[PDB]
Design a binder for this molecule. Structure first.
Ligand SMILES: CC(=O)N[C@@H]1[C@@H](O)[C@H](O)[C@@H](CO)O[C@@H]1O
Ligand SMILES: [Cl-]
Ligand SMILES: [Cl-]
Ligand SMILES: [Cl-]
Ligand SMILES: [Cl-]
Ligand code: NA
Length: 129
């Protein structure tokens, strides 16, 4: 599923991401924009053999199991395929664990390079929330 911007903001807010760990909703929408272009089916292979999955590009090195990342962890205790469903509950719940482990949203390379320090509020402007 390719979400619309305001559609994704509404689903993230419904699942309790707005201001989760102090990150306003515009940060989460922005990160999803640049990690996946709002596409729940996005995947990207990393140079170390791991893979990033879903609308927030969560990495199999630590957070999910895909059966093909030797020596990796599954800290969110989910198959990585659960991060590709049109329902973002799995992605949101895993994002809550990731963003809580001490480094905040810097865990998302696209957020750090393209959202951090910008006017992230623009990404939820105009949305009825
Ligand atoms: C929280 C998380 O899994 N972030 C990943 C990161 O691990 C990976 O290096 C990158 C690849 O482009 O995409 C995402 O930012
Ligand atoms: Cl915001
Ligand atoms: Cl594995
Ligand atoms: Cl949803
Ligand atoms: Cl933080
Ligand atoms: Na894994």
């Amino acid at each position: 599923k390719v979400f619309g911007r305001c559609e994704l903001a509404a689903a993230m807010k419904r699942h309790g991401l707005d201001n989760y760990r102090g990150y306003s909703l515009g940060n989460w929408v922005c990160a999803a924009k640049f990690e996946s272009n709002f596409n729940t089916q996005a995947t990207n292979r990393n140079t170390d053999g791991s893979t990033d999955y879903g609308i927030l590009q969560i990495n199999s090195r630590w957070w999910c199991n895909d059966g093909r990342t030797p020596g990796s962890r599954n800290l969110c205790n989910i198959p990585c395929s659960a991060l590709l469903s049109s329902d973002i509950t799995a992605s949101v719940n895993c994002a809550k664990k990731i963003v809580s482990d001490g480094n905040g949203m810097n865990a998302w390379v696209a957020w750090r390079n393209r959202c951090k320090g910008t006017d992230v509020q623009a990404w939820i402007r105009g949305c009825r929330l």
